[PDB]
Coordinates of C-alpha atoms in Angstrom, one line a residue:
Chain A
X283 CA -50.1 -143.1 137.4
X284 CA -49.8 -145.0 134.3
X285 CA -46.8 -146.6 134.8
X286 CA -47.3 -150.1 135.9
X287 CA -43.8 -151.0 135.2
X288 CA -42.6 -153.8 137.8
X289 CA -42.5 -157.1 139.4
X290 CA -45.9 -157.8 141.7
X291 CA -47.2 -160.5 144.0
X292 CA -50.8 -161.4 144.9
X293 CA -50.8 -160.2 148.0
X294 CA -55.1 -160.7 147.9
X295 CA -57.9 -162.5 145.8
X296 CA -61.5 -162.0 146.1
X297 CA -64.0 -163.9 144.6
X298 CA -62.0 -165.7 142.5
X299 CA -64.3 -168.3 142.6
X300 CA -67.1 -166.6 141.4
X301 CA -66.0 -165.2 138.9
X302 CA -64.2 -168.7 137.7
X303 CA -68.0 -170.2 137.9
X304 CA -69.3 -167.8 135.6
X305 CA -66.8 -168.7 133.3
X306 CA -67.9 -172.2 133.6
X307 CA -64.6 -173.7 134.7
X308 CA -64.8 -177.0 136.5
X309 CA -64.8 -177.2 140.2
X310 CA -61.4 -179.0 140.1
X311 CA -59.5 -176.2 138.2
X312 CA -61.2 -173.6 140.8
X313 CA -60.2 -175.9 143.9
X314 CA -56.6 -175.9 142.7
X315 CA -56.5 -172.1 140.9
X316 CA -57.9 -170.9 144.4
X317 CA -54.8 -172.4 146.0
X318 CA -52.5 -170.8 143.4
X319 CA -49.8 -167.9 144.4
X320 CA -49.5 -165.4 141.3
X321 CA -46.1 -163.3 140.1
X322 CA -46.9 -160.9 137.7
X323 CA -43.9 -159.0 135.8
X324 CA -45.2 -156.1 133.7
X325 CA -42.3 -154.8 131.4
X326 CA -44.4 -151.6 129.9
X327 CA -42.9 -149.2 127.1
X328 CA -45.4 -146.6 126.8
X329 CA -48.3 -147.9 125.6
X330 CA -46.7 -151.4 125.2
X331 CA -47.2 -153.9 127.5
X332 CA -45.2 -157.5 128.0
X333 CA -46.9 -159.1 131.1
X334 CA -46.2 -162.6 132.4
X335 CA -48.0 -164.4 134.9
X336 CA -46.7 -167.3 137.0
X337 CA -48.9 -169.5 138.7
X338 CA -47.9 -171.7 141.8
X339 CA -49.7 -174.4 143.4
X340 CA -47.9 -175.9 146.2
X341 CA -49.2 -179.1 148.4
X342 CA -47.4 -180.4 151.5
X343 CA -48.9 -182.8 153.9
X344 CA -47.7 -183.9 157.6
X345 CA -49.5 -187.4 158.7
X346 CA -47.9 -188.2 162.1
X347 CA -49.5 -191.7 163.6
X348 CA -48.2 -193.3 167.0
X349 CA -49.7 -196.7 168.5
X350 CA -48.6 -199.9 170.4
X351 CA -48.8 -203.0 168.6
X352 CA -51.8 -204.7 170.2
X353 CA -53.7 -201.6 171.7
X354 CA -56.2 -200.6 169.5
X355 CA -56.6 -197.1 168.9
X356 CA -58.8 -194.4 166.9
X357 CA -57.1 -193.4 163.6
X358 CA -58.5 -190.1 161.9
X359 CA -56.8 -190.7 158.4
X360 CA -56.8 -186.7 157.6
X361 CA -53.9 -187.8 155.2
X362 CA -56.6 -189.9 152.6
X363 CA -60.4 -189.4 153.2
X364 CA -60.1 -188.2 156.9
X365 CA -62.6 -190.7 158.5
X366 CA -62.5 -191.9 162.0
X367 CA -61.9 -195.6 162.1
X368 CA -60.4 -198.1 165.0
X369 CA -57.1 -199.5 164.4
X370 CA -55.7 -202.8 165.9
X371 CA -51.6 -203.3 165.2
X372 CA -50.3 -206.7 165.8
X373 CA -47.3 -208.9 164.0
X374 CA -47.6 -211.9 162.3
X375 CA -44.6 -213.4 161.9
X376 CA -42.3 -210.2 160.9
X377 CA -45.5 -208.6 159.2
X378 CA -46.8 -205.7 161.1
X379 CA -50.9 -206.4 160.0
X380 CA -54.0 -203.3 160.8
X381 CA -56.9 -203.8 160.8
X382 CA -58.6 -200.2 160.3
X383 CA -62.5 -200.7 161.6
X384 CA -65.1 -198.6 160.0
X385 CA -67.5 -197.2 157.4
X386 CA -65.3 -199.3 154.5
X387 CA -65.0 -203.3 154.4
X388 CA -61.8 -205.3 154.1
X389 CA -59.6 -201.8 155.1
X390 CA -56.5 -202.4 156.3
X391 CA -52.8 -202.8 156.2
X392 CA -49.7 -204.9 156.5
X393 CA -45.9 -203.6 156.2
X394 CA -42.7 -205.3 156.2
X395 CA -38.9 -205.3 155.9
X396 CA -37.6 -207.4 152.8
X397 CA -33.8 -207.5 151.4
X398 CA -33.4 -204.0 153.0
X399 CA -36.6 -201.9 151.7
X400 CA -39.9 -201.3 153.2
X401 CA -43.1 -203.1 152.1
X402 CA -46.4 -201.1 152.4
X403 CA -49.6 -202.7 151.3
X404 CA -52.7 -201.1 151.3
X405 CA -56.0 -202.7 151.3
X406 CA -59.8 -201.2 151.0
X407 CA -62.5 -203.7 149.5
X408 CA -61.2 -205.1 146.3
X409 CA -58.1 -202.7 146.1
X410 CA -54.8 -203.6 146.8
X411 CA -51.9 -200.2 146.4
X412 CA -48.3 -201.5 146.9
X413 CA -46.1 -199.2 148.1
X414 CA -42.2 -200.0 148.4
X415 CA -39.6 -197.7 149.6
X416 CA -35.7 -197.4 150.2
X417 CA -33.7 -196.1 153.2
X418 CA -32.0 -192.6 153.0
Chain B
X181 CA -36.7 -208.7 161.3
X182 CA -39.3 -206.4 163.0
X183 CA -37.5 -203.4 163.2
X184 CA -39.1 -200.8 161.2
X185 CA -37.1 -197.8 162.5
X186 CA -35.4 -195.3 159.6
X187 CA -36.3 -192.7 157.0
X188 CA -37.7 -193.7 154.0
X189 CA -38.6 -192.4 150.6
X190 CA -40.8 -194.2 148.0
X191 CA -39.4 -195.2 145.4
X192 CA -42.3 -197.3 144.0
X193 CA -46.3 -196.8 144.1
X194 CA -48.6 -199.6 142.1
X195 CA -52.4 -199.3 142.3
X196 CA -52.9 -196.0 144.7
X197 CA -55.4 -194.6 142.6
X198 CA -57.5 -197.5 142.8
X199 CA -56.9 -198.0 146.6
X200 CA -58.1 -193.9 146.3
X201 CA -61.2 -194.7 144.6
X202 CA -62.3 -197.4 146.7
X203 CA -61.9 -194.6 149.8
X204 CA -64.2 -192.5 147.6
X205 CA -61.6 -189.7 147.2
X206 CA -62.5 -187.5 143.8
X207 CA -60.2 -187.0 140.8
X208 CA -59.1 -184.0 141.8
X209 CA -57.6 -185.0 145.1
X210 CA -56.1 -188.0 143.6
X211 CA -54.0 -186.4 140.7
X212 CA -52.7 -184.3 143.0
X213 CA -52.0 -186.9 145.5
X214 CA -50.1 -189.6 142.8
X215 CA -47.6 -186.8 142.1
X216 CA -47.0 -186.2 145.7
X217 CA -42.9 -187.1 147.0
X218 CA -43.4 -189.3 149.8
X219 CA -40.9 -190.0 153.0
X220 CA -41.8 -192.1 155.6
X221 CA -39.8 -191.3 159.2
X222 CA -40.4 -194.5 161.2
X223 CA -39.5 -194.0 165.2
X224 CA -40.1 -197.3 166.8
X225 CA -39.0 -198.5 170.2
X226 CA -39.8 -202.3 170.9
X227 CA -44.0 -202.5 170.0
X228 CA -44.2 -198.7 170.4
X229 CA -44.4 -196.8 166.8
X230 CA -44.4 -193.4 165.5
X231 CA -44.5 -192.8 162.1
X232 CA -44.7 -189.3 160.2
X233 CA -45.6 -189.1 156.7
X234 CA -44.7 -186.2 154.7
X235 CA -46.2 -185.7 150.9
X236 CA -45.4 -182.9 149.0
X237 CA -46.0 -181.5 145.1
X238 CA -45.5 -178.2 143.5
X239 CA -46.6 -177.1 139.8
X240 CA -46.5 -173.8 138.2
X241 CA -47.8 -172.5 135.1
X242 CA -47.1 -169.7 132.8
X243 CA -49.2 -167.3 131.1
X244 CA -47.5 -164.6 129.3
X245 CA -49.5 -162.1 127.0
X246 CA -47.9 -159.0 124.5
X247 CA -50.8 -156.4 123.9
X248 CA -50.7 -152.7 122.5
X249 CA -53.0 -150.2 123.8
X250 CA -55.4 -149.2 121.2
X251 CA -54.7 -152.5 119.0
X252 CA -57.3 -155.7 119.1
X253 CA -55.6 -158.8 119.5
X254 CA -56.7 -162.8 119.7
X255 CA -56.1 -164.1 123.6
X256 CA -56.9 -167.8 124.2
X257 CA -57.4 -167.9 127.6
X258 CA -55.5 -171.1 128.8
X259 CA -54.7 -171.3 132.7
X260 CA -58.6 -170.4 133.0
X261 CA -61.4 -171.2 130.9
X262 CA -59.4 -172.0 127.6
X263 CA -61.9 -169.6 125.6
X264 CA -60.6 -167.8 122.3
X265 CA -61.5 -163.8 122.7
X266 CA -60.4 -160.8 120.8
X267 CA -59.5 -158.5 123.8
X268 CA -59.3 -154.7 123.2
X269 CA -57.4 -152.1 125.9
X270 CA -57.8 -148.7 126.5
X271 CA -57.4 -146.0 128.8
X272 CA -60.0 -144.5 131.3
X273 CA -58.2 -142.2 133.0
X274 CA -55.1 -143.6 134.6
X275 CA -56.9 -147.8 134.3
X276 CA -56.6 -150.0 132.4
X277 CA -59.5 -151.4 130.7
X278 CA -59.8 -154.3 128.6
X279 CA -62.7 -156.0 127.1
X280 CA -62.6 -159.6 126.1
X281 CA -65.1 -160.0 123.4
X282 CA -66.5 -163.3 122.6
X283 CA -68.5 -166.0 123.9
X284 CA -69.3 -164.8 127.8
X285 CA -70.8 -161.2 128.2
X286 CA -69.8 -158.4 130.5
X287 CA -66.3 -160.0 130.3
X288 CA -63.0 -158.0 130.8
X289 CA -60.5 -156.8 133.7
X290 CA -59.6 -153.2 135.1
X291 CA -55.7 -152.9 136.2
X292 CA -54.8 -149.9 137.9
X293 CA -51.9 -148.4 140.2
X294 CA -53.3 -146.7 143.5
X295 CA -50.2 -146.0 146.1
X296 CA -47.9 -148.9 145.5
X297 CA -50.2 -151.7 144.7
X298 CA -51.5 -153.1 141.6
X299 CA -55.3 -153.1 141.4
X300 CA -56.9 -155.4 139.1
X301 CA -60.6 -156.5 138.9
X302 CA -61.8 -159.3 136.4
X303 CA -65.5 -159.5 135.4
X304 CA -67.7 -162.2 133.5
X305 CA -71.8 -161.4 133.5
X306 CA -72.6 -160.4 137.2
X307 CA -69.4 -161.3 138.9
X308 CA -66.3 -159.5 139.9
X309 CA -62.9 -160.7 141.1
X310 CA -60.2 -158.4 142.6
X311 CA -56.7 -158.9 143.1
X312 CA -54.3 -156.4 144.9
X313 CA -50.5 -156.9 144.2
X314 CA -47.6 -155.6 146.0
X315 CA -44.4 -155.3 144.9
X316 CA -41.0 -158.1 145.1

């Protein structure tokens, strides 16, 4: 049939990659195009076609971490660069301090609760990342 | 105080791209990851600590195109390989058949209807995509 009338949903994509290398597209667009869902609706009057195609790219993450302060443990950080290093939780003062042991220098982290927010700072080498967040 | 225990959202986020670089995650990654919506659920009794992160970003896009069968038109292929062609449709039978004249050869797509699924196959030089689409 001829009629293509409708509302469709990927439902399967084959060498999309390929053919988005042979268009020379950068391996960043592909990594995220690849991930896309796609809606097509096709509103078709005889030989006249409207078609608009939405493109989704969704990301969601889970990074669950338990430990005891003071009992060093192994840390897979699968959440940033997923490397294995050995974590050691202790307080100073009412500064929860890691030390993450591995492949990278200075790597760590200390967190603490000021006025009534939560204090993340981040350390690897000569980069400090500040993180501060409120209770819901 | 040392009690971490709540749920927390981040409401502030200095210097995590540089923190990113220095774990040698890629461009790519870390665009994505500075958009990310971050909660922190901290469950902490006395030195014992669980903490579960969860990031999450969603983006779409739209690409909508009008065409007449029989009648060149000028497509600029944004979404993809952001490529100016003159595409030209036809009819083979009951597909579709375009060709997207330009810069890349062999380039074009075949959209067909076979059962209740949408066929449609995208080429450039030697390599061919397909996508099957059901209907919403």
């Amino acid at each position: 049939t001829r009629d293509q009338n409708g509302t469709w949903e990927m439902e399967s994509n084959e060498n999309f990659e390929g053919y988005m290398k042979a268009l020379d597209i950068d391996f960043c667009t592909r990594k995220i195009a690849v991930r896309c869902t796609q809606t097509k609706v096709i509103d078709q009057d005889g030989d006249n076609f409207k078609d608009k195609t939405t493109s989704t790219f969704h990301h969601h993450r889970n990074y669950d971490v338990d430990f005891t302060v003071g009992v060093e443990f192994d840390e897979y950080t699968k959440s940033l660069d997923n490397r294995h290093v050995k974590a050691l939780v202790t307080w100073e003062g009412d500064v929860l301090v890691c030390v993450q042991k591995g492949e990278k220098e200075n790597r760590g982290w200390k967190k603490w609760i000021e006025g009534d927010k939560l204090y993340l700072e981040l350390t690897c080498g000569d980069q400090v990342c500040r993180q501060v967040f409120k209770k819901k």
